[PDB]
Amino acid sequence: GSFVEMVDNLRGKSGQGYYVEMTVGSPPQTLNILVDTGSSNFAVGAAPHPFLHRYYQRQLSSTYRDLRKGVYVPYTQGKWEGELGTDLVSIPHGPNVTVRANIAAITESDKFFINGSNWEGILGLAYAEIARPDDSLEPFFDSLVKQTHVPNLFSLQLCGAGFPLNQSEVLASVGGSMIIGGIDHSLYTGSLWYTPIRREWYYEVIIVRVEINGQDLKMDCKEYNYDKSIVDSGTTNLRLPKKVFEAAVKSIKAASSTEKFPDGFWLGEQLVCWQAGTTPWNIFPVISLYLMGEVTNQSFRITILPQQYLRPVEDVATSQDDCYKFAISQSSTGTVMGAVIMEGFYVVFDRARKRIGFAVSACHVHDEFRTAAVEGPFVTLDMEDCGYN
Amino acid sequence: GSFVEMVDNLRGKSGQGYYVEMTVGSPPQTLNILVDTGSSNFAVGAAPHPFLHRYYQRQLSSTYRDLRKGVYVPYTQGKWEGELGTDLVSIPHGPNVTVRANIAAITESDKFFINGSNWEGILGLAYAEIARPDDSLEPFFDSLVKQTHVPNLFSLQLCGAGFPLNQSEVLASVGGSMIIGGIDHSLYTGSLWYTPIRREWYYEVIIVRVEINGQDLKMDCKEYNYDKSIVDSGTTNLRLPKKVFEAAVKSIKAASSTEKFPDGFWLGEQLVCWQAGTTPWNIFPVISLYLMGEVTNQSFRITILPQQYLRPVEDVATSQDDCYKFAISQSSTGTVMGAVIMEGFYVVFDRARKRIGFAVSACHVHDEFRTAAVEGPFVTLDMEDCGYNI
Numbered sequence A: 001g002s003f004v005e006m007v008d009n010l011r012g013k014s015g016q017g018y019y020v021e022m023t024v025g026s027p028p029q030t031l032n033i034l035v036d037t038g039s040s041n042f043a044v045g046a047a048p049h050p051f052l053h054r055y056y057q058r059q060l061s062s063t064y065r066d067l068r069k070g071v072y073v074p075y076t077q078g079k080w081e082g083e084l085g086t087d088l089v090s091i092p093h094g095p096n097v098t099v100r101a102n103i104a105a106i107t108e109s110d111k112f113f114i115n116g117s118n119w120e121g122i123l124g125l126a127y128a129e130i131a132r133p134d135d136s137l138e139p140f141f142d143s144l145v146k147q148t149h150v151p152n153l154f155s156l157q158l159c160g161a162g163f164p165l166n167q168s169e170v171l172a173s174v175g176g177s178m179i180i181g182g183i184d185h186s187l188y189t190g191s192l193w194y195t196p197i198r199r200e201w202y203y204e205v206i207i208v209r210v211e212i213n214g215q216d217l218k219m220d221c222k223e224y225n226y227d228k229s230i231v232d233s234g235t236t237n238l239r240l241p242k243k244v245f246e247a248a249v250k251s252i253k254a255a256s257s258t259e260k261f262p263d264g265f266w267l268g269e270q271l272v273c274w275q276a277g278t279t280p281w282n283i284f285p286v287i288s289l290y291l292m293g294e295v296t297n298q299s300f301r302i303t304i305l306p307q308q309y310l311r312p313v314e315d316v317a318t319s320q321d322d323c324y325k326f327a328i329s330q331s332s333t334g335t336v337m338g339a340v341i342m343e344g345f346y347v348v349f350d351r352a353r354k355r356i357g358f359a360v361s362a363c364h365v366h367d368e369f370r371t372a373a374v375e376g377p378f379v380t381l382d383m384e385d386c387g388y389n
Numbered sequence B: 001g002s003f004v005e006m007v008d009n010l011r012g013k014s015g016q017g018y019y020v021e022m023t024v025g026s027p028p029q030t031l032n033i034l035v036d037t038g039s040s041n042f043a044v045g046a047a048p049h050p051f052l053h054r055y056y057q058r059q060l061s062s063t064y065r066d067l068r069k070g071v072y073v074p075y076t077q078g079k080w081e082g083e084l085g086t087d088l089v090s091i092p093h094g095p096n097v098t099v100r101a102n103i104a105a106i107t108e109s110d111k112f113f114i115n116g117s118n119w120e121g122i123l124g125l126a127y128a129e130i131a132r133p134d135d136s137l138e139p140f141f142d143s144l145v146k147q148t149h150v151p152n153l154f155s156l157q158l159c160g161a162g163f164p165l166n167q168s169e170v171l172a173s174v175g176g177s178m179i180i181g182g183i184d185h186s187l188y189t190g191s192l193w194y195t196p197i198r199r200e201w202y203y204e205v206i207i208v209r210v211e212i213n214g215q216d217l218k219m220d221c222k223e224y225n226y227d228k229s230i231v232d233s234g235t236t237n238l239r240l241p242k243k244v245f246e247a248a249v250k251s252i253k254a255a256s257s258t259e260k261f262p263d264g265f266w267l268g269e270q271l272v273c274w275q276a277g278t279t280p281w282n283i284f285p286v287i288s289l290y291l292m293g294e295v296t297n298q299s300f301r302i303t304i305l306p307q308q309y310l311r312p313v314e315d316v317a318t319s320q321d322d323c324y325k326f327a328i329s330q331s332s333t334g335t336v337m338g339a340v341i342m343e344g345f346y347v348v349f350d351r352a353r354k355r356i357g358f359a360v361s362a363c364h365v366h367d368e369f370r371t372a373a374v375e376g377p378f379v380t381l382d383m384e385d386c387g388y389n390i
């Protein structure tokens, strides 16, 4: 019911990622690790890097075991080269257990570490199927559950501030909670609705309908999941398949037409600013994503506000204006429900029952007139046809 | 060949540098000078040093003029301290002119002079912007052009032997040509392709694409010129920015994977040897560097062989094996197209038209199956974006 020891154990923000503290080796080497539900490798910087002020020093760990094998891991954003091995790992603000897990010691990288993010590694929480080099390299969460009694489930509450957080602020602020092995009821309001995990590789789900301010985008639902739809804390934006993205932007533009913005804004590249406190939230539409339910021909929906899809950023002039970037972008690899979307909800990755739960987050940003929502049920047919093959 | 007097006026090798003979003072004092397109100061040993068997003696020159000013000049490799002055300078196997130029008389140095190199000074041929102490100290070539009718251009043909040269051999062998004021057609084959000199300080260029055996390295082209790319005869290796180096080595290892080499080899530190005549050139890939062309959206490429990037060295046991060191290394100061790269081509430093020309060298080392090349044109867009801006 409650896991006080794990509540508020996350820090960070949508644009730089959310991270949890972990320790590797003996004696314990503390490192901040990016929580990534969109990959399956546990890797840490293991050599000096301009953006790192600390890294994993294998020669100083008595429990380090060298697997005598290198691995090359590229992501959409960047990539790293690492040396595989194992060591004892713990989560200070997590379950009171120690696990021997696989660790990729990063020796070379390109556009992977983020300057000023405060994290030095990544925690891939997805399934073995997409682990590199292959599925024989057991993911951290799998080792955790196998070696301990911790229930096969974790939940994430990512908290966007709603405004820019400067360097010192983001280091001192609570970014959210990662409850390992349970669900903490204080992190959400209303009811939890579950959508099935279609297949166990990414946390894959199926979107069956999309609305912009109640208006049906009206596309073949297969387009929404081409070539897949995933829940990914390791990606900032809500990324949509090319065809869906173009349709969504046209609709969002139509709904917010009382004000015109440069193309660069809609490309998610340039920011838009308004005098302090005057952001016209009301001219932007809410976005509803209907997800397949656990009951036959039943679906539910999660609704996102512009407070979620417009990401706060500090103005180039550090002025007092409230500025933002459009956090919805085009994808060529399916739908990616990133951090800005997760920030509106408490998300339960129920691996044990092969499902993902959504509930209104106790820390989501909104205004006096609208709120994010998770509602159901709705009658929906042939939802399995929405999945891509 | 329209400049027979300057053809074959160079001696030396990639590992110790190529030098030209010059005279300074009245009466003329002969000295061997390192040809360095990577710096802009003309300086000579002017005091006894263990590695010098001769040096500039100012008190014996009636035309020596003291500028009453000292200067400290450090390079990545080493450094020297000297006293500035001017004197009359000539190049015996060069244009038939005498010019008064600035000369830094080296009185102290650290890791600058090389034992057995046979040179006693350095000729910085780059622009005034990087001259020490500042750009008011006119570089030698600028003085030469201003005081004479020599065209504002020089060309270099650096000739690597393709095998080790002992002390005696390196002293009697022709190391190449420095044509002052012109282009000698006998030093190259095929056509000359020109890339723009981006800015006049180092001889800076812009690389727009890189291939290893035709396979695109596929990096943002800005990486190739971070923070700059230069043509430098004063450096042995092809030096590449950290990330480009890592990518290049990975690809070169992949292409030559039928043979495994120790990390020390790829670090450019230890040599690898093969039984005489059996070097497996064919397992190593050719490397192509695409350079911005003179025409809009057009580029050309220069391709080098392992015969260029594997530098011949004498075996530690002076055996009959053919040994080499990997002559590609990482840099934290941008790309450096060093001597091992220049050895594959005839390079024209066309200062007058702010461009650098490349053509297959008549003396590049190759085998019966592959040759170095300079080919074009290729359609390339947004090349200006490949250049780096601080």
Ligand SMILES: COC[C@H]1CCCN1C(=O)c1cc(C)cc(C(=O)N[C@@H](Cc2cc(F)cc(F)c2)[C@H](O)[C@H]2CN(S(=O)(=O)c3cccc(C)c3)CCN2)c1
Binding pocket: A014, A015, A016, A017, A018, A036, A038, A039, A040, A041, A073, A074, A075, A076, A077, A078, A079, A111, A112, A113, A114, A130, A131, A132, A232, A233, A234, A235, A236, A237, A333, A339
């Ligand atoms: C919070 O976000 C922070 C800001 C700043 C920097 C990145 N970033 C983004 O918003 C952003 C944007 C885009 C367009 C992509 C990514 C992206 O690749 N994320 C990765 C994790 C990651 C986070 C980083 F911080 C840097 C980095 F190198 C990578 C995630 O694991 C993606 C990976 N892919 S896969 O097909 O490659 C892929 C598939 C299967 C296995 C692997 C190993 C990779 C699938 C979806 N899950 C992140």
Ligand SMILES: COC[C@H]1CCCN1C(=O)c1cc(C)cc(C(=O)N[C@@H](Cc2cc(F)cc(F)c2)[C@H](O)[C@H]2CN(S(=O)(=O)c3cccc(C)c3)CCN2)c1
Binding pocket: B014, B015, B016, B017, B018, B034, B036, B037, B038, B039, B040, B073, B074, B075, B076, B077, B078, B079, B111, B112, B113, B114, B130, B131, B132, B232, B233, B234, B235, B236, B237, B339
């Ligand atoms: C053939 O090579 C022979 C073998 C044996 C010994 C050196 N060497 C190399 O291969 C080698 C290696 C490395 C890593 C560096 C150098 C290097 O500094 N070369 C210098 C010239 C030089 C040659 C020597 F022989 C000894 C020596 F002291 C220096 C060149 O002018 C470099 C200098 N820089 S700057 O930023 O410093 C620099 C920038 C602007 C002004 C100055 C004054 C210095 C820019 C690129 N142009 C040479």
